[PDB]
């Protein structure tokens, strides 16, 4: 049906705890940040490794917060 409103401290993101970043719904700002960190598709689809990567994003403030600080370059 509808999506849950709880992502108000996060952002738009194709990530899930079961299979990781869905590269078909994954945002371009996300792929950007991950390539400069040296992350591969194998790691983005690792539900274990992608969780660690995502835990940092929802921490700072979500996809929007990482973008604000990415835009410094």
């Amino acid at each position: 049906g509808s999506h849950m409103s709880n992502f108000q401290h996060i952002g738009h993101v194709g990530w899930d705890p079961n299979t990781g970043f869905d590269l078909n719904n994954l945002d371009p700002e996300l792929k950007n940040l991950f390539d400069m960190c040296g992350i591969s598709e194998a790691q983005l689809k690792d539900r274990e490794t992608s969780k660690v990567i995502y835990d940092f994003i929802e921490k700072t403030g979500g996809v929007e917060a990482v973008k604000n600080e990415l835009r410094r370059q």
């Binding site: 940040l33 960190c37 835990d55 990482v66």
Partner: protein
Amino acid sequence: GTVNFKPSRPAPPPPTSGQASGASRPLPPIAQALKDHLAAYELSKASE
């Protein structure tokens, strides 16, 4: 035309005043912090 007071007209922004990024500079420190945060995981795979 000729005016005595209060022209009351809008204006565009000043030419070239909007500077932009372009130089081939290294990664932002938010990305550097994500590298260090993911390293805390990678190191833990080889540690208690």
